[PDB]
Design an enzyme around this catalytic site. Structure first.
Site, PDB file in Angstrom:
ATOM      1  N   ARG A   1      -0.424   9.114   0.346  1.00 45.95           N
ATOM      2  CA  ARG A   1      -1.228   9.256   1.559  1.00 45.95           C
ATOM      3  C   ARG A   1      -0.624   8.487   2.738  1.00 45.95           C
ATOM      4  O   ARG A   1      -0.968   8.753   3.891  1.00 45.95           O
ATOM      5  CB  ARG A   1      -2.660   8.760   1.308  1.00 45.95           C
ATOM      6  CG  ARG A   1      -2.726   7.248   1.115  1.00 45.95           C
ATOM      7  CD  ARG A   1      -4.150   6.700   0.939  1.00 45.95           C
ATOM      8  NE  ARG A   1      -4.057   5.319   0.467  1.00 45.95           N
ATOM      9  CZ  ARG A   1      -3.982   4.988  -0.814  1.00 45.95           C
ATOM     10  NH1 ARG A   1      -4.042   5.939  -1.740  1.00 45.95           N
ATOM     11  NH2 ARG A   1      -3.856   3.717  -1.171  1.00 45.95           N
ATOM     12  N   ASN A   2       0.266   7.537   2.454  1.00 44.78           N
ATOM     13  CA  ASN A   2       0.870   6.715   3.506  1.00 44.78           C
ATOM     14  C   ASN A   2       2.293   7.125   3.834  1.00 44.78           C
ATOM     15  O   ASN A   2       3.026   6.385   4.508  1.00 44.78           O
ATOM     16  CB  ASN A   2       0.833   5.228   3.126  1.00 44.78           C
ATOM     17  CG  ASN A   2      -0.560   4.657   3.209  1.00 44.78           C
ATOM     18  OD1 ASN A   2      -1.380   5.143   3.993  1.00 44.78           O
ATOM     19  ND2 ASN A   2      -0.854   3.644   2.389  1.00 44.78           N
TER      20      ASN A   2
ATOM     21  N   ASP B   1       0.828  -1.220   0.000  1.00 42.33           N
ATOM     22  CA  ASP B   1       0.000   0.000   0.000  1.00 42.33           C
ATOM     23  C   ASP B   1       0.853   1.257   0.000  1.00 42.33           C
ATOM     24  O   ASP B   1       0.621   2.188   0.783  1.00 42.33           O
ATOM     25  CB  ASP B   1      -0.984   0.016   1.181  1.00 42.33           C
ATOM     26  CG  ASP B   1      -2.069   1.086   1.033  1.00 42.33           C
ATOM     27  OD1 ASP B   1      -2.311   1.585  -0.105  1.00 42.33           O
ATOM     28  OD2 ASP B   1      -2.699   1.435   2.056  1.00 42.33           O
TER      29      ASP B   1
ATOM     30  N   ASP C   1       2.585   4.054   7.163  1.00 40.42           N
ATOM     31  CA  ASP C   1       1.438   3.178   7.372  1.00 40.42           C
ATOM     32  C   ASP C   1       1.838   1.793   6.933  1.00 40.42           C
ATOM     33  O   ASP C   1       2.531   1.632   5.925  1.00 40.42           O
ATOM     34  CB  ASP C   1       0.214   3.633   6.573  1.00 40.42           C
ATOM     35  CG  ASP C   1      -1.057   2.879   6.974  1.00 40.42           C
ATOM     36  OD1 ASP C   1      -1.230   1.709   6.573  1.00 40.42           O
ATOM     37  OD2 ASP C   1      -1.888   3.457   7.705  1.00 40.42           O
TER      38      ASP C   1
END
Lengths: 261, 261
Positions: free
Chosen positions: B147-148, B143, B161
């Site tokens: 955004r992470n 992932d 994350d």
């Protein structure tokens, strides 16, 4: 939680050390709410001693001691150190470390023209380091001004004081909407940079508070101080961006000033 | 082996430090599974604090704490640092280092157009260094997306994350066959480069997940961002080779980006 119920005059003492009156000696008055004394603390160290003016209400007493309670939460090279408080006895006292050179604005006026650009930038860097520490503690100051900074013999500057507002030092969104954030403290820091680089001129000179309020919303900004390096003035201008999200953060400011030095 | 038999909710704590609740102070909510707080940790440092939403099952509890367990195995400049967890008490908390500039995609959208190509490439280099470390640890992320990634004041980017899949970021063989490898993370890294160089545009714009799936198998690739150096876009295109064995490895990417800088 043993403090579900608590008297506010005890709640404000949490981050303070209670000092016995026999340990403290006031020696002379150095400032004048209430009075400030120079004194000694047996722990023997020199200290500043703040007292509360006779006739105070309970609310004023809580506000007074709360100042010490705020100070006591902090531990940083550029934040004034709290030695302790006398709260159980009268007169009540807030005991802090002694700072030989007094308030920054008064100091610069008396030593006008006497520092190198590097020394002045060093003072600003210390203040910025102090404010970065506060911002990281999620503490919004609201009254950052050279008058609230103290200077010791090594020229180390410490933040020392913790709806009337200080209009000349306050960001437009805070004056208009009471919107106080670390970004409005950044605006105030820009004003402090100007106070430092002009050796303690009053921000906006003889203009009235109303003229200042109108001027800043019209886009007026304080002009460059004499002999101020352009990179220093440019940083001031960044601190005074109308849109608060465009102002640099205190961590950014510390990095910028470090690269200059 | 003393841990032949173990409760999964203890197994996930292995690489974590248990923190006493009296050491942690949540101060405000900064995001919202569960909530994220800004807080302080006495060890006093600012931290980010993740909690788990009320009513969670045991499986969710294990998954929640396991996130901390994964993070705790890692130690690298470009991977978020775990301070510790509160697992013995409610509410449970995952405590990580505080990152002043928040999520990379949000950050770039707010500072759109404000960075130099060198600064942007520097961000990508740090992300690549983080992913090289993960790949060397034999850790496949699955992932990787802007955004992470979290950003601190010095613009250091850290991977932060750790079935439904993030379709826009996922390699074709992983979407089709659930074949996740470091080479599919490399595909995701190419998407992240595009997110960075467009200042936080959504990959494939308003196209639906279905249109994206079909497009990438049809050979469609995202076009060069505006002002993107051709060598940066060429590297993106290499990350998006349909044959995963043709994609560069993260060590290759780090070397390529270093030569550019």
């Amino acid at each position: 939680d043993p403090h579900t119920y608590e008297d506010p005059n005890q709640a404000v003492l949490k981050f303070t050390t209670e000092i016995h009156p026999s340990c403290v000696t006031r020696q002379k008055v150095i400032g004048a709410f209430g009075e400030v004394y120079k004194g000694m603390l047996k722990t023997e160290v020199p200290v500043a001693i703040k007292t509360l003016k006779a006739g105070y209400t309970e609310k004023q007493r809580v506000d007074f001691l709360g100042e010490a309670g705020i100070m006591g939460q902090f531990s940083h090279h550029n934040i004034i150190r709290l030695e302790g408080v006398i709260s159980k006895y009268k007169p009540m006292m807030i005991i802090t470390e002694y700072m030989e050179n007094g308030a920054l604005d008064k100091f610069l006026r008396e030593k006008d023209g006497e520092f190198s650009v590097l020394q002045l930038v060093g003072m600003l860097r210390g203040i910025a380091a102090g404010m970065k520490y506060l911002a990281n503690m999620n503490y919004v100051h609201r009254d950052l001004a050279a008058r609230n900074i103290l200077v010791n013999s090594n020229l180390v500057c410490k933040v020392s004081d913790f709806g009337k507002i200080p209009i000349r030092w306050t960001a437009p969104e805070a004056i208009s909407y009471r919107k106080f954030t670390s970004a409005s403290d950044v605006w105030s820091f820009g004003i402090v940079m100007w106070e430092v680089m002009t050796y303690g001129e009053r921000p906006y000179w003889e203009l009235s508070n109303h003229e200042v309020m109108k001027a800043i919303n019209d886009g007026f900004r304080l002009p460059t101080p004499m002999d101020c390096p352009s990179a220093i003035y440019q940083l001031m201008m960044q601190c005074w961006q109308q849109e608060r999200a465009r102002r640099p953060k205190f961590a950014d400011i510390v990095s910028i000033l470090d690269k200059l030095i």
